[PDB]
Design a protein around this ligand. Sequence first.
Ligand SMILES: [Zn+2]
Ligand SMILES: [Zn+2]
Ligand SMILES: [Zn+2]
Lengths: 169, 327, 197, 76, 75
Amino acid sequence: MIKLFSLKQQKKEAAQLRIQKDINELNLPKTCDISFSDPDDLLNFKLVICPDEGFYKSGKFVFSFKVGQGYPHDPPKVKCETMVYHPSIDLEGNVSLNILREDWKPVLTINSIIYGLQYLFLEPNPEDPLNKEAAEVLQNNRRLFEQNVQRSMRGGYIGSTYFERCLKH
Amino acid sequence: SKSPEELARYCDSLLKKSSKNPEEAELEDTLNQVMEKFKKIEDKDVFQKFYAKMLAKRLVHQNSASDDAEASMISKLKQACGFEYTSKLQRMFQDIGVSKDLNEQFKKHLTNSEPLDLDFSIQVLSSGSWPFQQSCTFALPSELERSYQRFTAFYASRHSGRKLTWLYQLSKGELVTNCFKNRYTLQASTFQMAILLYTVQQLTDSTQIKMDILAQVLQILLKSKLPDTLIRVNINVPMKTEQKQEQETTHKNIEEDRKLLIQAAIVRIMRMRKVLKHQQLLGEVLTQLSSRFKPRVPVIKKCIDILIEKEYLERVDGEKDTYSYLA
Amino acid sequence: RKKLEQLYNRYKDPQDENKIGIDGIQQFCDDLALDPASISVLIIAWKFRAATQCEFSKQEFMDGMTELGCDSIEKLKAQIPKMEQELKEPGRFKDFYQFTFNFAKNPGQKGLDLEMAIAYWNLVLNGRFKFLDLWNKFLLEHHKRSIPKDTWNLLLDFSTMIADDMSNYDEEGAWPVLIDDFVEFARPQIAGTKSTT
Amino acid sequence: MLIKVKTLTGKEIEIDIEPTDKVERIKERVEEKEGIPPQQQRLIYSGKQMNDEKTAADYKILGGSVLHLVLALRGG
Amino acid sequence: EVKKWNAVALWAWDIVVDNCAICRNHIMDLCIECQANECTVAWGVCNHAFHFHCISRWLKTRQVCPLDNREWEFQ
Ligand SMILES: [Zn+2]
Ligand SMILES: [Zn+2]
Ligand SMILES: [Zn+2]
């Protein structure tokens, strides 16, 4: 304990509030809902996207949002709790979305994140994949990628990976 | 073997207004040769940068000798550098045209209501696609004060929803002489012209001009004729120790854009790779980034050192000289 | 276990239940007879898995002492020579060294103040690094900003993997460019001298 | 119809629209008001990213409707 | 005197002016970092505004206006 001395001399004489503004102003699609375990603490919550259209149509995918104290300057850490067959999402549950890391700017909102997050399911892209096999099938065969995504959401094996059923009820 | 900043200066020299008036096929043949040289060049971004920056000054000064030549060049550049590069150029190109048209509309409007002493020709550019910069602190003494607010009238008549940021650093005007012995005529920068009614201390304040630039101006005024100290020729002239500054500037900006480019690339490759040794990383960053330029590896390394602190990648433990990707 | 609770109750401040104030931290150092700034106190803070300096959370203190199996200060002091001996064989000296980083900084920041990280280098890297003082002269001159985490971390591998005269050093290698900065600054002055160590 | 659009400054702007109008035009109206180039803009209407050459009647946008503006999105 | 003077100006977009886009606070109000305890306003050539504290930090990452990708410069 080095600087311990200095502190003593100075002894003798919420920053968000932003994520608050994000949440108040939040506008959710009919496909997306959010949950809070602790209504008092907004820096943690959950998001559920149920695509009504696309390959992932009729499916339930839940993401977790952890908002650091460096918000808006630091981006939220979000991960996909649902095991899914997607080029931009890995079995480890890491998400490849530009706004989440490099293209993040502190002019954005949780709303923004939600739109990009849904956008993955709307417009799945083989470019710079987290899952290479998924990106490869998406790349060469859309028919098979569709059949695959379906089998992945109803639950079943594709490869040696058992994909567990995520269907919305 | 010129090379790339100098090849750009070369092209400027070719396309600029000169006392010679180059014939068309000369222009075209030269330009074709320049592209031939350009294809051999390693760092093209510096070339593109200087070319654009100069092309700006040409267009804004009406100093192009041949318009169809410029147009042909931009054609050739688009063929090579692709659309994204020539987008800015092209918009610069058309924006000058609509600027000339708006200026003429103001000419038609100039001799009806209240014509005054100045024959007033202003060129206005987008917010915008033009590489220029905001003007310094200024004064705008005496008679010119009339035209400014006069100008600032009629836009409100056309579209009232726009704001004009005036570059006085790029603005020149003509003056004539009586008082001295032998008659001459002089074109001066508006900076030069504003000095005309004193000591540099109170002069700076009265003109509200920064002393740093003020000295740059008055040194070049003194080397022509006439801080606390008291004070077709033509006197508007580029300043020596300055405008070297803008070269440094330009090179800095190209360095920065190069950093962004590199970082992006290496992220791409790390994800693609998942893991790689330093050597292989550098190799790939190179072969991937070559067509635009060829980075000095201390730059590549400062980029890695940056993507470490931002937590894009980490060093594999126990393996020296090896990086792995994050999330 | 109640004994530990009473000792802790002697150290903690009345405002926070879990956090140990600085008045009590120097009390804690006084009873171990050491200096607050000592290497050993750092080793203790390392063993408690402390988050930051001058600051002991209840969980840190409690769990630290319980796996150190000490019911008192006097029982801790006797464990000090036990801790020092851990570094030697496969280490976990590295882990201690790297611990020092996040320990010494403020946990709102990714960097480390420059007058700091010198003090802790003169502490941990003392005797392991010859030109260490030269290094401190560097960046008191040529680099005025904070130390990056990876730079800190890698300085051990500098003090260990490469020679005193910096013969096997590569500037085209994987080192932090600040290490390269130092070496470039270094070789000129050191390549004309004969090491007696 | 006058549609409201939520910008990135944290406010809401009403703008003039015809249903036949292509949606890339609305981007330009938003540039005019908010000073953000139509080149980088993405319009989200109720959860989905609005197209460019497609029209506003293709999205069934009414005068009470609200648009969300966000920057470009890429998966990777 | 001047017979002929040709000048150069850039038309920039005029902006609503009301709200910091970083804190999503009001510009006249303190920035959110200062709200938890000198806080003033900064401008840009695009005519967008921010608190000093917000935009400075944004710049330390990258030199641009965050809203438009334009190079950042003060008034
Ligand atoms: Zn703010
Ligand atoms: Zn503030
Ligand atoms: Zn802006």
